[PDB]
Amino acid sequence: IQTQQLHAAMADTFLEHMCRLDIDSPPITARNTGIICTIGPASRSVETLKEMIKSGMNVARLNFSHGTHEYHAETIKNVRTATESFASDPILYRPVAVALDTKGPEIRTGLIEVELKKGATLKITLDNAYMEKCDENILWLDYKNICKVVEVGSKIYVDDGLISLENGGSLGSKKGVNLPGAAVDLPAVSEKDIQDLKFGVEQDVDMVFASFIRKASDVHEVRKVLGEKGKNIKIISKIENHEGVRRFDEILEASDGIMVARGDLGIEIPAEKVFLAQKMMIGRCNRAGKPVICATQMLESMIKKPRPTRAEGSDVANAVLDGADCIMLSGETAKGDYPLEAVRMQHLIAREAEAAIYHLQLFEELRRLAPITSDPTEATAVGAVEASFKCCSGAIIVLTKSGRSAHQVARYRPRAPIIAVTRNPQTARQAHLYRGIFPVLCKDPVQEAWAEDVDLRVNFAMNVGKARGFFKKGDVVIVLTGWRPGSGFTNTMRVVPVP
Amino acid sequence: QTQQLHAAMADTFLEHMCRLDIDSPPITARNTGIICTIGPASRSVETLKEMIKSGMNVARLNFSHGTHEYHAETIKNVRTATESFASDPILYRPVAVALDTKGPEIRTGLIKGVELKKGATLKITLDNAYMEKCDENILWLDYKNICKVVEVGSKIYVDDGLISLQVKQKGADFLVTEVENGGSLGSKKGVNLPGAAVDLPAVSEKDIQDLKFGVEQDVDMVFASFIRKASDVHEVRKVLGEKGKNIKIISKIENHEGVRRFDEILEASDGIMVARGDLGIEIPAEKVFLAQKMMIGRCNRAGKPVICATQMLESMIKKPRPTRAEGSDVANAVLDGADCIMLSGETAKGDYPLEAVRMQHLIAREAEAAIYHLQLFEELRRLAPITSDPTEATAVGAVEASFKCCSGAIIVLTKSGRSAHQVARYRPRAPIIAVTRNPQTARQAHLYRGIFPVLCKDPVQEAWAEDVDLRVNFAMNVGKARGFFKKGDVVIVLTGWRPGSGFTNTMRVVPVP
Amino acid sequence: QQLHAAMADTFLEHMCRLDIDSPPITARNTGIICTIGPASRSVETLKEMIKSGMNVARLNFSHGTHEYHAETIKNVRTATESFASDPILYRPVAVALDTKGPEIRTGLIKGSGTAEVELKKGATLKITLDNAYMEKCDENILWLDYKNICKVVEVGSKIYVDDGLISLQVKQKGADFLVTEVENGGSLGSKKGVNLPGAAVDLPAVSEKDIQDLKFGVEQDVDMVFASFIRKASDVHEVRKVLGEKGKNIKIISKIENHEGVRRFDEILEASDGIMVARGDLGIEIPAEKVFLAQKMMIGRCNRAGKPVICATQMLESMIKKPRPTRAEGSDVANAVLDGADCIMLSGETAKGDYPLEAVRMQHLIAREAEAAIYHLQLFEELRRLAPITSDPTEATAVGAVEASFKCCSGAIIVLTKSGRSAHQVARYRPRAPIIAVTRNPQTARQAHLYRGIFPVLCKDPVQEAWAEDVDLRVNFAMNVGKARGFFKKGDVVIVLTGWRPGSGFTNTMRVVPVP
Amino acid sequence: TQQLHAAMADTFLEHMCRLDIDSPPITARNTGIICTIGPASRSVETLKEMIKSGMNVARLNFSHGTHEYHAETIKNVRTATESFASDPILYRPVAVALDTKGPEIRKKGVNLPLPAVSEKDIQDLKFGVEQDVDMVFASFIRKASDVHEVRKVLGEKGKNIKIISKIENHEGVRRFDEILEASDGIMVARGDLGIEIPAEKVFLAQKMMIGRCNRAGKPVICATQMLESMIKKPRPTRAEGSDVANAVLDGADCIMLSGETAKGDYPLEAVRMQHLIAREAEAAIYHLQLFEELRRLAPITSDPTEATAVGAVEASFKCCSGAIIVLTKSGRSAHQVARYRPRAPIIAVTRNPQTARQAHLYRGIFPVLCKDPVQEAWAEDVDLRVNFAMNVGKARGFFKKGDVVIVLTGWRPGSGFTNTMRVVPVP
Numbered sequence A: 001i002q003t004q005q006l007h008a009a010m011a012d013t014f015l016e017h018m019c020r021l022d023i024d025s026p027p028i029t030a031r032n033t034g035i036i037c038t039i040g041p042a043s044r045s046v047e048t049l050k051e052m053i054k055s056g057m058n059v060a061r062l063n064f065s066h067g068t069h070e071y072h073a074e075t076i077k078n079v080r081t082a083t084e085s086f087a088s089d090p091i092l093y094r095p096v097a098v099a100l101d102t103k104g105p106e107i108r109t110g111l112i113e114v115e116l117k118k119g120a121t122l123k124i125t126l127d128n129a130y131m132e133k134c135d136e137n138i139l140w141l142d143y144k145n146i147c148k149v150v151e152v153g154s155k156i157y158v159d160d161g162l163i164s165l166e167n168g169g170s171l172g173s174k175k176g177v178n179l180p181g182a183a184v185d186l187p188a189v190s191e192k193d194i195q196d197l198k199f200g201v202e203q204d205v206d207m208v209f210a211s212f213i214r215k216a217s218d219v220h221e222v223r224k225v226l227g228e229k230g231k232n233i234k235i236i237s238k239i240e241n242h243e244g245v246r247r248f249d250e251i252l253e254a255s256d257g258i259m260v261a262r263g264d265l266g267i268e269i270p271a272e273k274v275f276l277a278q279k280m281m282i283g284r285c286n287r288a289g290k291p292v293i294c295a296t297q298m299l300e301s302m303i304k305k306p307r308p309t310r311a312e313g314s315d316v317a318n319a320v321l322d323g324a325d326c327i328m329l330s331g332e333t334a335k336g337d338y339p340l341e342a343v344r345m346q347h348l349i350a351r352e353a354e355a356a357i358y359h360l361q362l363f364e365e366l367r368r369l370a371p372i373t374s375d376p377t378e379a380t381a382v383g384a385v386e387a388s389f390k391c392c393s394g395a396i397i398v399l400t401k402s403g404r405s406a407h408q409v410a411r412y413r414p415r416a417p418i419i420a421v422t423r424n425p426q427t428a429r430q431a432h433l434y435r436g437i438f439p440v441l442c443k444d445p446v447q448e449a450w451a452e453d454v455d456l457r458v459n460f461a462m463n464v465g466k467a468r469g470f471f472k473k474g475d476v477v478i479v480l481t482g483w484r485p486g487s488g489f490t491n492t493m494r495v496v497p498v499p
Numbered sequence B: 001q002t003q004q005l006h007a008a009m010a011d012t013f014l015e016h017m018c019r020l021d022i023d024s025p026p027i028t029a030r031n032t033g034i035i036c037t038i039g040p041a042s043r044s045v046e047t048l049k050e051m052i053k054s055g056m057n058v059a060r061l062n063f064s065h066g067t068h069e070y071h072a073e074t075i076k077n078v079r080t081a082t083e084s085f086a087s088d089p090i091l092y093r094p095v096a097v098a099l100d101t102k103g104p105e106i107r108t109g110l111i112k113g114v115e116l117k118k119g120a121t122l123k124i125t126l127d128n129a130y131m132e133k134c135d136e137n138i139l140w141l142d143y144k145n146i147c148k149v150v151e152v153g154s155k156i157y158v159d160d161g162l163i164s165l166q167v168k169q170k171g172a173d174f175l176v177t178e179v180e181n182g183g184s185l186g187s188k189k190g191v192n193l194p195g196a197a198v199d200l201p202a203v204s205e206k207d208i209q210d211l212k213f214g215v216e217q218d219v220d221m222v223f224a225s226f227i228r229k230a231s232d233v234h235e236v237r238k239v240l241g242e243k244g245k246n247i248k249i250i251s252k253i254e255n256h257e258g259v260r261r262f263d264e265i266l267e268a269s270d271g272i273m274v275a276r277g278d279l280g281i282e283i284p285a286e287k288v289f290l291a292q293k294m295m296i297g298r299c300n301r302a303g304k305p306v307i308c309a310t311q312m313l314e315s316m317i318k319k320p321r322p323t324r325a326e327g328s329d330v331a332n333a334v335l336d337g338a339d340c341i342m343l344s345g346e347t348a349k350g351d352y353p354l355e356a357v358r359m360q361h362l363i364a365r366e367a368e369a370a371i372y373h374l375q376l377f378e379e380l381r382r383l384a385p386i387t388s389d390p391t392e393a394t395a396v397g398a399v400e401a402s403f404k405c406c407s408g409a410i411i412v413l414t415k416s417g418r419s420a421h422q423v424a425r426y427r428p429r430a431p432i433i434a435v436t437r438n439p440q441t442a443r444q445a446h447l448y449r450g451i452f453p454v455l456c457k458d459p460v461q462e463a464w465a466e467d468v469d470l471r472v473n474f475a476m477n478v479g480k481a482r483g484f485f486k487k488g489d490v491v492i493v494l495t496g497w498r499p500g501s502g503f504t505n506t507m508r509v510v511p512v513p
Numbered sequence C: 001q002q003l004h005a006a007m008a009d010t011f012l013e014h015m016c017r018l019d020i021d022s023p024p025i026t027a028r029n030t031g032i033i034c035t036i037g038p039a040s041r042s043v044e045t046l047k048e049m050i051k052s053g054m055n056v057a058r059l060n061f062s063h064g065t066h067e068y069h070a071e072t073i074k075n076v077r078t079a080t081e082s083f084a085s086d087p088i089l090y091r092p093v094a095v096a097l098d099t100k101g102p103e104i105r106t107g108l109i110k111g112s113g114t115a116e117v118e119l120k121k122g123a124t125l126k127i128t129l130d131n132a133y134m135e136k137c138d139e140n141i142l143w144l145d146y147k148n149i150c151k152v153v154e155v156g157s158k159i160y161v162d163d164g165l166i167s168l169q170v171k172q173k174g175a176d177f178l179v180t181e182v183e184n185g186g187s188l189g190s191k192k193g194v195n196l197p198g199a200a201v202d203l204p205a206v207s208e209k210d211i212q213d214l215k216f217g218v219e220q221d222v223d224m225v226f227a228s229f230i231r232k233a234s235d236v237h238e239v240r241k242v243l244g245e246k247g248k249n250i251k252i253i254s255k256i257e258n259h260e261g262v263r264r265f266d267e268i269l270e271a272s273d274g275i276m277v278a279r280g281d282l283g284i285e286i287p288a289e290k291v292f293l294a295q296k297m298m299i300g301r302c303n304r305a306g307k308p309v310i311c312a313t314q315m316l317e318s319m320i321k322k323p324r325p326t327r328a329e330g331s332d333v334a335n336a337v338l339d340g341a342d343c344i345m346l347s348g349e350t351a352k353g354d355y356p357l358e359a360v361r362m363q364h365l366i367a368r369e370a371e372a373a374i375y376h377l378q379l380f381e382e383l384r385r386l387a388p389i390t391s392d393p394t395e396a397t398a399v400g401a402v403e404a405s406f407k408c409c410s411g412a413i414i415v416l417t418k419s420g421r422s423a424h425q426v427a428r429y430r431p432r433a434p435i436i437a438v439t440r441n442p443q444t445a446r447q448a449h450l451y452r453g454i455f456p457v458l459c460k461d462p463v464q465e466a467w468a469e470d471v472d473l474r475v476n477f478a479m480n481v482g483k484a485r486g487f488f489k490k491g492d493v494v495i496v497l498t499g500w501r502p503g504s505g506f507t508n509t510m511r512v513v514p515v516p
Numbered sequence D: 001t002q003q004l005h006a007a008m009a010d011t012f013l014e015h016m017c018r019l020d021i022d023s024p025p026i027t028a029r030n031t032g033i034i035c036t037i038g039p040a041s042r043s044v045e046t047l048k049e050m051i052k053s054g055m056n057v058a059r060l061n062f063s064h065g066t067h068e069y070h071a072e073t074i075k076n077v078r079t080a081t082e083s084f085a086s087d088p089i090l091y092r093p094v095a096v097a098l099d100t101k102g103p104e105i106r107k108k109g110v111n112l113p114l115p116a117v118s119e120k121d122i123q124d125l126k127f128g129v130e131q132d133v134d135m136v137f138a139s140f141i142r143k144a145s146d147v148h149e150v151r152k153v154l155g156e157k158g159k160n161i162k163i164i165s166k167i168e169n170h171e172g173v174r175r176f177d178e179i180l181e182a183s184d185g186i187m188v189a190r191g192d193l194g195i196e197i198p199a200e201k202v203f204l205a206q207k208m209m210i211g212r213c214n215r216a217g218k219p220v221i222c223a224t225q226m227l228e229s230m231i232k233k234p235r236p237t238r239a240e241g242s243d244v245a246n247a248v249l250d251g252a253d254c255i256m257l258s259g260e261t262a263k264g265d266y267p268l269e270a271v272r273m274q275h276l277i278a279r280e281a282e283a284a285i286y287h288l289q290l291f292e293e294l295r296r297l298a299p300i301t302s303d304p305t306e307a308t309a310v311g312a313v314e315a316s317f318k319c320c321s322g323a324i325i326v327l328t329k330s331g332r333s334a335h336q337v338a339r340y341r342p343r344a345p346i347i348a349v350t351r352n353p354q355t356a357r358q359a360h361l362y363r364g365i366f367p368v369l370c371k372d373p374v375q376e377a378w379a380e381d382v383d384l385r386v387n388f389a390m391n392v393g394k395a396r397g398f399f400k401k402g403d404v405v406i407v408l409t410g411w412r413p414g415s416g417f418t419n420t421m422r423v424v425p426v427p
């Protein structure tokens, strides 16, 4: 047992790399995959959120499919209270990002659970009269132009795909309806969505998970609503249907990142094909260097049990091996009985899978597919990661203001952690979207001599790395800086020993 | 689109991932075998027939529970459902019977004939007076030498890993434990002692009766629970003796010692099962995927069957649709290189045994198309040594030829299955149609990825050349009827130069007549 | 056989593992083409050329008459049939006809064929097309046979005479005259070759002289044609039509010796049966520092296409006058084989040199060494990666047999073939083991030398009545050939390729059998 | 352009198929040219033409000749070299190499498959240290003891003189690993090597020694008979052209000319041909495979200079940089960059004149001798030397204003602290 699966990292083939995986080779830590947890009744309290952060929650997700604005406002206030409870020591302080998940073009049912028999008959009524008198033969939908977008012989899936219209069971109240095959004329940004996004920018959110993004214009519509006041809010496009998968290329280019929303995608396309769409979207985002999130049902059984299933354990690890920048928890942290155990489990799995990555092939294929550029920062990023592998550096220290220089380093997936020193608090929170970036917010005021002010932030990362066990005095690290203040000038790579 | 063949011709693994297409329909022939545990929800002849039609290849009997009378009837029901299709040998699908041994299990007593509290006090005693009298305060387990294996504050898990304890005080015939993770206790629950060394024998006195029962019931394979060393496999082999010398022994690796000594266990085994259920308790659950990918790769390297098992579609016990994690697990096990995937409670006792079998079938077929054959075939060859066996050279030549012509199938005539096993080791994309007159060979063929066994019941022809061609034409008709290929396509045919095992040396690229 | 360097994971350490103490196998896979001339024309010398390793005899039709060439062909066929007493060790020898082509030659120096003049650099020289000076050239006026030499060369052009050794600068141009200034001088002889780089030489690709030479080749039953100065694919079609129906099985080798032939190489190779990198004229028509680029480009493209490629000209040039080559020439032989050249050639080394046999032996020695040094692991992988999927059962059987040959490290791949296609499809994937190609067609046994690794063997036994017994006779004939020539011994594992019915195009059966 | 289409091929076979004779190479020739100086090129005026035609190292064959004669050849070499010193932007350093006579039994030349440095070798070696030669071609080196024997003879006075051993027999090939570890480089002396071992095996030992030297990051010279026919002819043979190109493709840092420049009839033509072929073959190398295989076999390091070097080569491929500018005092930092064989030329700025002359032994290093005085502010003195390299690349046509280049410097003055890589445009 060497460490960090380094015996397997030196295998000439991927098959031999698999054979040399050792359960007794413990991970030289620094977890390089971000953990996003949806907040709900089980995790809304300040004391709970403090434990979630200590257990490894890097992004708090707000699902605007439910709850009011004042409800989500207290959640945000609770998240910032729990996060700022560690701000007394900036060396150990961990930024925590806030994410708004839009409701999007949803389709619900009416009120009163009944019992749907297989082969029975139910008259789907887009009639506001029976909006509360739903039985076993008269179901109501809130979709305008449902009769136009549907064709005879097609299928309809109510309550997260449980009932099929066919295979149906106990139909509840106000359950979601999925209409695969697509034709949904519902707007990309609804009236509720517009007010939610305007609420998000008012609340200084860090990122937006846009639901049911079908085409590239949907992301432009979302970015237009965020306006100039929220122009720095990263837009993560959720791919949840067939149209989003086919139009993924134009969606990826218009978006800041992608979430593989496997829950709705598992209903819109055959569930046996979800792994295809996941490994495809993760590969293309890794190719383009944009964040990708694997979400939904990763540790589903932990909603009721303190330990996950074997399938759930492998799913989290395989999402990391796929190359996902972040993993997500929904009901496991929003409503389950073991939110802290779900967060801790994803942290332990991610750390093991990060060591089991075949870096030798990944780094070669990432450069082989990346184009030649004239951006000096991009060339500095490859040279830094190449140097980091060459000397087994304890970290790559990147001074960045917008996060860009750190993102360009993370695109090439170094094994060493990326310590991104920034004075921009939003940049530090947003850095969690990119694999391997450990953001550190330096609150020290700006010095007069610019060379000394850069030396300050470098030494800040040194103490942070020594305090968190990333390296020790005398170790080699890679330091990325630029030639003048302001963003966009990162061009200097140094190999320096830590003091 | 078709077959993920645009992704199959990528220069890098990353580009291969980028070219994965949900709109490219899969092959047709599912290569990864499906093993289903037969239990109350599936042991009926009517259900078993639909299990076979849904894709079940191996019927696994878990001897951790049930009597020999109960298992004999289940086996009888499996063969009644299987022989229900024996009238048309062209469409007849062999179905193997697997015996899963109890092994060195540690079980608890019977609750009165409860519900533990989180952080309470649980006294674990060996006094047999509390065996049929278990309460929330006194707990009896059948591992007599328990205190001579556990120490201070040792973690001890009950109820398939759910309830967790901590030996707060020791004793000689009792143990005082403080609950670390509460939960509703039960009767006759399994107990794991991770980080300790149980001294129970590899083959218990009960396993002797079940292994002898398996021989007289003509089972095709034994799943030996809790193998730790090569000598455990030899013990199972010696116990089976001459009457069970052809029964294949699958070593179930479910603890730290089995993983540590996997190489010697694999060398002595006929195959391996990644029994993730117990393994996820004996070692940290976040490390299971490492042990699975290690054992699958090593078994692929050695050309030996590997089974990924336990909790693959666990939520389907109660729901007609699996979770996304379960959808990825089945797909990733196939992509890892597993010859077989298994279902336990999903088929033995769950509410949707047929939906679980169908889901594994659909996922496995999709995953098989998504395999990066350009890298896999290249890496399996560079790692396999140069050989003098003509069958090995013919097998890899047949696989290379099947990739070159995009063959509809690789037809293999075999008595023992070996020649077909040697083809599957190189993982062709095309299905391997192994024609045989040995019914046991046809059932045992399901252990190897891609082998579609067909049982030839035609009488032996007078001229050997005619008997060979009769069996080749049987595979032709089978592939045509099963939709594997059509007339005009090219298939590879593997025969030998003389009758008897061990002479396969002839590879022919023939058109489908 | 450099087996340690063959198991390396990288090309670099494969080079580091190259061992001068690891001996090669017996079978030399690279064909040797020997140009026959005054030093190699006799039946006695030709016998030793075959014993030294000659597989193809080249006849350069730029000089000589039909009767002189017919007697050379007769002496060749006599020297090879001298060994027809033992069909086990009988090595076939092909005959190749190198066309004259659109050549530009000067007149005679002072009415003599042997006289020479010394051109001093910087002086002047008049080039005229008036036939009155065709036999009266000197250091002042030079005659050449290209009539349109003025309507193709402008002022400042550079003319090269005698293998590009003499260079002229076209100072002033005339209607039928050409005023030049000598750049590089020296001895100017009679009837020397003239190269006009960068000029559109409008000479016919198939002149009337070549038309009769090709008709002579058809009548003399030549195996292949080396077509000089192929500029486009239509030039290969003209050669194809002249050979007509009677010369249909005569393989056409397009000689790339100009800038246009390199630029239009794709359409030429697709219309050709083979390619020769004729570096002599190529080194003059294009800069000499670019010849290796054209050589590696053409060798790789024909390796990718599965068509024969030949490395020619000045490979052991110093051996014309000396019994041992230079280090550069020894390096050029091995690098040609390492490049992937199906055959290496000798021109003046065997045509007129003082050591024709030593050059043949030197080429055979270096080829055997470079064959073992080939990175088969990367070559076979890259050849399969770039070859398309096929619906032909023979091609799938060929790559399967080669793949099986690497798995067992077989002594050989025995291939029964009538037209040679079966053996060519095996050689296309470059197995390490020799390809013993059994045939009853004498022409295919001669044309098989054009493909690397094919050891052609002509069976003399009569066709047995039972076809399955006639196959085993030919199969066991190759076993005798392999055991005799030391390619393998009893107990060794070999690959044997047969078909399912007589006639060409049915090879589909691969058998892994031990040597009886 | 410089076979850029062939460089982007996914396979080595497709890389050959893409080699285009119509894709012109860059003006920067990375392979050093060593010319043996003799009667045909001893004059001051031709030595100027030899330099103008691309000569980088002047080899003095001590198998014959006296010290008063070889010192006059050196003086003329330094005379012709310093004739261009009136312009440090275009000045090219020219190295001086002493090839020892060694155990040479003679009155022709006898070979048969003896001391390392006998009395004649020591006197000539001491004359080399007195004449301030940059390197010594130790003739016939059979074991590492011979290299130590020679290194002890040069002493601490010539401790910086680079000992590069000439492998000339079967023993040196078998004991090559211990010889290479004790040497500063290797010359594959193909002349004597072709006699001691079968001629058909010379290419085996050549590619063996070049690959191992490439692996170890030590210079290797391919020597002798590369253009032999040019001794009496103005154009080489096709085999000689392919030999020059294949040596460069093998990975040889320098190519050599012996009789072609020493006594041949076309000295300048032989130097020009080696120049033209070298740059054509440099564009034809499969950098995609070479860079990967060089790193796969290079071990993990803890030296900041080695990590900065491979990071700079990786960055230079990423931006297709015009050059890798490396400030170096001993040349070592430029040597570590050249070990990973970048496509871009390595402009090694130095003030040490010997470091500049010795840099010709390493592929891709273009040494420039900075004559400007040291500045008080060290940061300004660094930018001055960086600006010197920028003006050199523009004047010599290696790149133009606006092009991207990699600049390697260190964090403090003194040798051994190169650790800073900057990606900067050309002003």
Ligand SMILES: O=P(O)(O)OC[C@H]1O[C@](O)(COP(=O)(O)O)[C@@H](O)[C@@H]1O
Binding pocket: A399, A400, A401, A402, A403, A404, A405, A406, A480, A481, A482, A483, A484, A485, A486, A487, A488, A489, A490
């Ligand atoms: O990642 P970004 O947005 O390009 O920021 C990197 C910037 O940080 C710096 O290192 C220092 O910038 P500041 O001093 O303004 O914070 C610059 O050299 C560089 O341009």
Ligand SMILES: O=P(O)(O)OC[C@H]1O[C@](O)(COP(=O)(O)O)[C@@H](O)[C@@H]1O
Binding pocket: B413, B414, B415, B416, B417, B418, B419, B420, B467, B494, B495, B496, B497, B498, B499, B500, B501, B502, B503, B504
């Ligand atoms: O895989 P196995 O057990 O070695 O069997 C393959 C055998 O089957 C055959 O194809 C047919 O032999 P039989 O006629 O005895 O069935 C033999 O040529 C070959 O040896």
Ligand SMILES: O=P(O)(O)OC[C@H]1O[C@](O)(COP(=O)(O)O)[C@@H](O)[C@@H]1O
Binding pocket: C416, C417, C418, C419, C420, C421, C422, C423, C470, C497, C498, C499, C500, C501, C502, C503, C504, C505, C506, C507
């Ligand atoms: O290579 P070719 O010209 O297609 O011929 C190969 C043929 O040789 C054979 O092995 C024997 O054919 P013959 O008996 O007619 O000579 C056939 O089975 C096969 O089709």
Ligand SMILES: O=P(O)(O)OC[C@H]1O[C@](O)(COP(=O)(O)O)[C@@H](O)[C@@H]1O
Binding pocket: D327, D328, D329, D330, D331, D332, D333, D334, D409, D410, D411, D412, D413, D414, D415, D416, D417, D418
């Ligand atoms: O390559 P070398 O010989 O180690 O020298 C490189 C050195 O040059 C420097 O750039 C400065 O050189 P100077 O001492 O001449 O100013 C150092 O930073 C570095 O250590």
Ligand SMILES: O=C([O-])C(=O)[O-]
Binding pocket: B225, B252, B254, B274, B275, B276, B277, B278, B279, B309, B310
């Ligand atoms: O026995 C089993 O199958 C297990 O533990 O997973």
Ligand SMILES: O=C([O-])C(=O)[O-]
Binding pocket: C228, C255, C257, C277, C278, C279, C280, C281, C282, C312, C313
């Ligand atoms: O014709 C030839 O062979 C040549 O030019 O090399």
Ligand SMILES: [K+]
Binding pocket: B028, B029, B030
């Ligand atoms: K199937």
